[PDB]
Amino acid sequence: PDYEKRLAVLKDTEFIDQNHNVLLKGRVACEINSGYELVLTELILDNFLG
Amino acid sequence: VRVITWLDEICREVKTASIIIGNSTLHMKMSRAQELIKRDIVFAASLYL
Amino acid sequence: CQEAATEESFQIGLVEVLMRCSLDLYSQGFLLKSVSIAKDTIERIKIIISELKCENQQVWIYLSQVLRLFIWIESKVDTLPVESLVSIFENSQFSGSEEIDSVDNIKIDTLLDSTTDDNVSIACKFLILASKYSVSDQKFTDIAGTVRASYWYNIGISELTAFITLKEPQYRDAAIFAFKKSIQLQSNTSETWIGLGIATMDINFRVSQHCFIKATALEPKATNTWFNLAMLGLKKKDTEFAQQVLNKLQSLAPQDSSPWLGMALILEEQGDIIGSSKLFAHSFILSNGRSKAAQFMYAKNVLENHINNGDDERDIET
Amino acid sequence: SKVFIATANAGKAHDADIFSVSACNSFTVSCSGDGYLKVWDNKLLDNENPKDKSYSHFVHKSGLHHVDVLQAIERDAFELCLVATTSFSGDLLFYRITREDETKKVIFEKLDLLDSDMKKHSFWALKWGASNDRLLSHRLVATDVKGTTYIWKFHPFADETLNWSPTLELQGTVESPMTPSQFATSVDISERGLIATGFNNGTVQISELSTLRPLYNFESQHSMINNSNSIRSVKFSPQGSLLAIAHDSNSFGCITLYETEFGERIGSLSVPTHSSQASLGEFAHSSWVMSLSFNDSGETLCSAGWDGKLRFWDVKTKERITTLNMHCDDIEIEEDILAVDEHGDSLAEPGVFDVKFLKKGWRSGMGADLNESLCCVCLDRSIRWFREAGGK
Amino acid sequence: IKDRFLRPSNALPWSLLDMVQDVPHTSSGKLDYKELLKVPDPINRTSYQFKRTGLEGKISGYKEEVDLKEVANANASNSLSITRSINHNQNSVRGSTAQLPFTPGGIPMKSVKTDSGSSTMANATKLLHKDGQGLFDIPEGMNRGIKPMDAE
């Protein structure tokens, strides 16, 4: 049940799509093994890093 | 030193992901960082050979 | 090979092993050196056909594949030592086809004196004959359709390639028939769903969309099926479709050059150039001469940035 | 294979700049601008820079810029070992080895092989060859101002047990095929027999030594400058048919991979190096590159740069494994350290001249089995050694 | 003084390389873009196998066989079977997460064929089925459809 609630946030944050499969956000995030992966994933989007 | 090592691990992890996403400049930057931080005491000899 | 004079296991195995030496290096980078083996081992293969006394379907598949490294790549037209392969049919046994002969009307020993013998077309015909005219299951086991259902794929694939390269409907027709009858005789192994989709949808918008959409059933993941669906961008004209289909590709498996290439094309055709350029360059970096358009379209887009400006020669990056 | 570490070090070897190194199983020797030879011993004691286990020798007034050693075993009559060095003037003085275990008094013979007429051609980029009964003559290739390659069959033995009779000879004169007349920069042989030749205008022309055969050539990669493409070191894989070319491009270094038959550029060995601050391109090193070298197998390539950087390039899949950084402060003992040169410049990133591998059982200073050891020499008159981690 | 500046260009300056070319869109369509489109590589359904002579038969006699399971040997689709072709793009351990992994033991991976049609492709092509004698309109996952040439 809690896992299914973790899916609710993972679907809302747009990492995995609503049909429960991985998107580009989820793909890029798949490389990061650290615990603070979601913010880090969100850091790479725009030219802010450039 | 540990922190620096883990940063090397990160830059590696992000490098792949950077490539995957697309931005080549970003990848280069990651690998520029990966060039500079890997040296001397940070990655010294493993004295157990 | 020096020890074993003429045995069925060793020297047939020498074809099965040394064929992929070519393909590997082609995939890696080296072509002109590695094609030498391919050219040389054909004559050896022929020599073995009579010596070892084993002209099986597997051998013909192997030689078909080796030949395929003079079709997917066509800068080795000057070397081409495949002109003396009609004697291979005289050396080996000849069972002969039934349905495939009626489509194009080209025999085993009726493709030498052709209408203006072009070299590429010589290779293409030697491919066509090699795959289609092979012997039946003589002293070789089987189990439910493996004799003439998998072999329709061998035919249909070769014929499809022949169409793709030369642009002739005659072979296309025999590909279509092959993939229809294979479909009839199996319809569960998920390779017949692709070729049929590819070939028949060249005629009009969606006759064999039944085949090409539902390839994903027993086949778990995609490679060329979702990429070629981007042909709807001009064979129907829906722009969002073109990119929204490739989203699923680049989300699941972005490692290949193809989806990157396709998106790059899509972004280009609308309006944007710099992002498109970036995409194309990235694709090139990924592939490194894996796809055709990976090298071509890169050079194109780069040259498009340098039309109406003329930057300074003292810039190193340019 | 991964990252190497200091097995042994040295500093302030010669009076002038140490332009090249020459290593083998028995010993290692360096040549320099003042023009001397110090034959450094391989077998050391535990945790000590020898220094005095490298006996000096007088050679030339002008200097010595390139050097290489060769070893062989023709018969039981004499265990073969031979050295030859090139000068700024351009005379290839041979040096015959005659060693003792205790004393180590390696005095050389007064070797003047060629007459005065053949020395019209200079001698710049020498390179020995190891032929294990493919061609009985011990191969050797040099260059000159006119663009020509000469070989010298040095057999002291009998029958074309074995009586003493040292001689000089010629296998075949390979000239500079390209037009107009050109300066031959560098050249090296191969184990298979396909022996290409490099030039000062970026083109590498493929050839053979014995047959006097010029095969084919290819165009350079962007050549519009004054010194557009200058090939420094052409090198080959010891087993395979690949060709690793090292050449320059205004400021930057350029390393390219080819093959002997086709001669097609599958890729150039490059990484994200610094160039134009933000907008990068593709180069091997940020500064110039001189000496490339393979390991015993022919997989890990190692280039020597002008920016004080060694980089380990994987040949099987074109990508760098890691980078070893060279500084003046890497020298062990305090007295030999030269931080700043006499004309006012910090030597934190000195010019690394010649890196060269030492295969299984050559070096054995401290903590090394049948190892793939390495040596290196820099602009600050230093000489250093490295080793593989573990071994087995 | 009397050479360096006033001597004209042997090459051409990039400022005066604006009259070089024009770039047509059409090559001289659909087939023009996708030249790479193609079916997968030829299938080798059969296989050469050679057994033994008899009692203590150290390679002499032999008899052949044929095999069939899942699909072609490649990590792009899946190929969870451990006997798979090793490509020239893999490290000692890490390499890349692109190529799909090997089998897990113990836990049931639910994927049974249930046949010697009937129920081989059960709820695979039957779920994705809509209009016009199985003419699958939409690519599955999303909702959109297709529009013929009359749009533009």
Side-chain angles (χ1 to χ4, degrees), chain C residues 175-179 181-182 186:
Chain C
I176 290 159
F177 190 77
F179 281 115
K181 299 310 303 186
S182 189
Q186 217 69 231

Side-chain angles (χ1 to χ4, degrees), chain B residues 4-18 20-45:
Chain B
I4 294 160
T5 310
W6 266 303
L7 282 167
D8 181 39
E9 196 159 32
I10 291 282
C11 290
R12 196 177 304 104
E13 287 164 283
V14 165
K15 148 174 130 58
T16 311
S18 74
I20 289 156
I21 287 280
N23 200 39
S24 58
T25 309
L26 183 58
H27 184 293
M28 288 160 174
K29 261 150 196 180
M30 297 322 300
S31 191
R32 270 282 291 169
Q34 196 164 322
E35 186 207 315
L36 297 166
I37 71 179
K38 301 173 81 175
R39 55 181 186 77
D40 308 285
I41 194 62
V42 147
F43 286 110

